[PDB]
Amino acid sequence: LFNEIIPLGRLIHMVNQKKDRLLNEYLSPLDITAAQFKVLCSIRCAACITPVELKKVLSVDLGALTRMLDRLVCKGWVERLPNPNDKRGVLVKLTTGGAAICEQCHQLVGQDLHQELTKNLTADEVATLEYLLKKVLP
Amino acid sequence: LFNEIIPLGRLIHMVNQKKDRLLNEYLSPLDITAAQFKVLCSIRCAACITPVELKKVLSVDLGALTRMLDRLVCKGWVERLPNPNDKRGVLVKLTTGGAAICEQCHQLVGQDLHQELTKNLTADEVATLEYLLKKVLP
Ligand SMILES: O=C(O)c1ccccc1O
Ligand SMILES: O=C(O)c1ccccc1O
Ligand SMILES: O=C(O)c1ccccc1O
Ligand SMILES: O=C(O)c1ccccc1O
Prior knowledge:
- The structure is a homodimer.
- The first copy, chain A, has helices at 8-27, 34-46, 51-58, 62-74, 96-118, 126-134; strands at residues 78-82, 90-94.
- Chain A is mostly helical.
- In chain A, strands 1-2 form a two-stranded antiparallel sheet.
- The longest helix of chain A has 23 residues, at 96-118.
- One 2-hydroxybenzoic acid binds next to helix 3 and helix 4 of chain B.
- Chains A, B: Residues 5-138 form the HTH marR-type domain.
């Protein structure tokens, strides 16, 4: 692995891959799926967002989103309200319980990933990788 | 950005995000979508793969995959064959043309991303980021 020249793009891929695999593994015992968790974190950040805008942010099939949003409402984690800047549409936001669920999860997974991801590079120091990864964003 | 302590997980996220955004931007002028490209690269690597296995590898709604696979067949990029280790199922593989399309794209995007992603950290040296990113995989 350290004897092969793998281009950054693929490495970022492989690592994101791993990151998600760990995520699924951490949510495996909980009554919620990785996808449901992602949809909650995305609606949260935006406070209120349209399903279509949410559809664009997640890069997902609209059909699967609709069923997804309905499942989330059934779980009492999401609710729909009229869109002010419109009238033919709605917005979806988290219900109080949904918000709590999203925070219980966000905290736990965030505490297991950091460890697992940093489990062996710590010496080289997460701060350095983080530093260089920032130089890629602007 | 360099004055805020953003945890690795989110940074990897934000960066993968960026990476995909560039991808969409590079394929924007071509008659193909990022999702179609991903499905082609995934089938390729595996040589031959079942739709369900492909469904698992991509983490996508089966419904959107089915329509996706049909669209790809219409474009002449993918073809279905009987699954040997089964008999009630099929495998999907790329057609010769599909293979070429996947290579024309893989080469171009791979040549624009490397540059764009490395556009400003080059000094710090992509090799270092790549090194540390590897220490995260095992
Ligand atoms: O679930 C909805 O209310 C919805 C509304 C508009 C477009 C896509 C959707 O899933
Ligand atoms: O409806 C869901 O719970 C769901 C969960 C994971 C992926 C796609 C989905 O529609
Ligand atoms: O497209 C198919 O042939 C297919 C077959 C089995 C399961 C999901 C699928 O999309
Ligand atoms: O069928 C497609 O071309 C397609 C493209 C991007 C995302 C989902 C899809 O089904």
